[PDB]
Amino acid sequence: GPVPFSHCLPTEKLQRCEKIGEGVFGEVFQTIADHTPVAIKIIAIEGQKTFEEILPEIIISKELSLLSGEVCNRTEGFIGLNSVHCVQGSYPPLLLKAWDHYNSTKGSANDRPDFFKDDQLFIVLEFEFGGIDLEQMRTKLSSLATAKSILHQLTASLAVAEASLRFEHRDLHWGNVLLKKTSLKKLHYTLNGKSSTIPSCGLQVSIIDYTLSRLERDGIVVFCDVSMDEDLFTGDGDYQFDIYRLMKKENNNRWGEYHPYSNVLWLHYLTDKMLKQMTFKTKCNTPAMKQIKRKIQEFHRTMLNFSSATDLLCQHSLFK
Ligand SMILES: Cc1cn(C)nc1Nc1ccc2scc(-c3ccncc3)c2n1
Ligand code: NI
Structure with a gap:
């Protein structure tokens, strides 16, 4: 099944989340997990893009991440993918607060993600920073x-x-x-x-x-x-x-x-x-x-x- 936001973003990890960027269908947060900086991308699914529309990004993120540990064709020049999760629930208020801070300082072209209900699914991709x-x-x-x-x-x-x-x-x-x-x-x-x-x-x-x-x-x-x-x-x-x-x-x-x-x-x-x-x-x-x-x-x-x-x-x- 899906997992709650807390599975990916336990209290302390969530407390340290700052918005650093966004896409037409995405919000990027920076945080710390086990003393290690990470970049989290959160994309809403169904309901905005469908799963089929998001899968390509998942596959590509995965394949490019693998190049860092290959042999014949090897590069670290793209970004590590640590994990992929399907999350269910309303947007965490601490994420909204971080969202607002970014809107106040840099300006967002996205919709404030406060309209999502508690059955909303998201894809959470966690990368190396x-x-x-x-x-x-x-x-x-x-x-x-x-x-x-x-x-x-x-x-x-x-x-x-x-x-x-x-x-x-x-x-x-x-x-x-x-x-x-x-x-x-x-x-x-x-x-x-x-x-x-x-x-x-x-x-x-x-x-x-x-x-x-x-x-x-x-x-x-x-x-x-x-x-x-x-x-x-x-x-x-x-x-x-x-x-x-x-x-x-x-x-x-x-x-x-x-x-x-x-x-x-x-x-x-x-x-x-x-x-x-x-x-x-x-x-x-x-x-x-x-x-x-x-x-x-x-x-x-x-x-x-x-x-x-x-x-x-x-x-x-x-x-x-
Ligand atoms: C999260 C990510 C990973 N891939 C393959 N693509 C991504 N997308 C974006 C979009 C916007 C921003 S604005 C800073 C980042 C960023 C900063 C540091 N470390 C990763 C991404 C960013 N990333
Ligand atoms: Ni997990």
């Missing part, structure tokens, strides 16, 4: 060396997911790139059996929000069908909203197919943001840093001629 998004870190990164590390981590992570699962993220905006301190000097990945390293520059990247993502295992495709969605393809003001139109154009509005080019489009959007909307604490006023800047500029202007993240990682001069 991945850190703070790249947008919030717009002014806080240290140098363009860091920016290069970040792009290399993203590119590799997508490459491995391409090789393993024929993955497309399909919404990798700078809000979905998390950063977290690591004392590791070098990060490791393995692509089709070949291991390599990336200088961390003190950070570990984690990719999130598989809400539009696509993959497959054994000829079964798991995805979000947005072919009858109109609103997604009629935004602007940011280069983000062009990617949605480019994907739709590249794939002829058939979202089951595999088009890893879409990973390249999103990495280009992120390289653009690195070059145009970030301010680094150290400026590129040394020969070595100017050089790094030039190579990122050269990546920006050439990467769109690569067919996938795999192609970029193996072949692009930025990573050699």
Whole structure:
């Protein structure tokens, strides 16, 4: 059967819940469990999305989480999934209070979740805490060396997911790139059996929000069908909203197919943001840093001629 909210969110864990984010159908809370930070996503089911509409996110979250402990195709560059629960009950008042605090400070585009009755079902996905998004870190990164590390981590992570699962993220905006301190000097990945390293520059990247993502295992495709969605393809003001139109154009509005080019489009959007909307604490006023800047500029202007993240990682001069 379903379980009460208290099964997932015992008193002390619930007391420490703060809202950190949201989606069109979701609320994300940060908390502590057994002295360990976690990120909780809570999605209402039936009644808003159906179970069938939520399952893809569950499967994808699961498959990408598994890549951290595989061998031939291995990456930590997406986020650990600790557990999945189907919960029944009205929204916990302590969660409402945390919800309100976020509405008062940042503003929510969601409905205050106070209208749910005690037979309401929810899917509660509990993840490792991945850190703070790249947008919030717009002014806080240290140098363009860091920016290069970040792009290399993203590119590799997508490459491995391409090789393993024929993955497309399909919404990798700078809000979905998390950063977290690591004392590791070098990060490791393995692509089709070949291991390599990336200088961390003190950070570990984690990719999130598989809400539009696509993959497959054994000829079964798991995805979000947005072919009858109109609103997604009629935004602007940011280069983000062009990617949605480019994907739709590249794939002829058939979202089951595999088009890893879409990973390249999103990495280009992120390289653009690195070059145009970030301010680094150290400026590129040394020969070595100017050089790094030039190579990122050269990546920006050439990467769109690569067919996938795999192609970029193996072949692009930025990573050699
Ligand atoms: C929870 C989660 C996991 N996946 C695969 N996707 C998710 N979705 C979102 C949506 C919004 C935000 S705003 C901060 C987060 C976040 C922060 C830290 N650690 C994970 C997620 C977030 N996550
Ligand atoms: Ni349980």
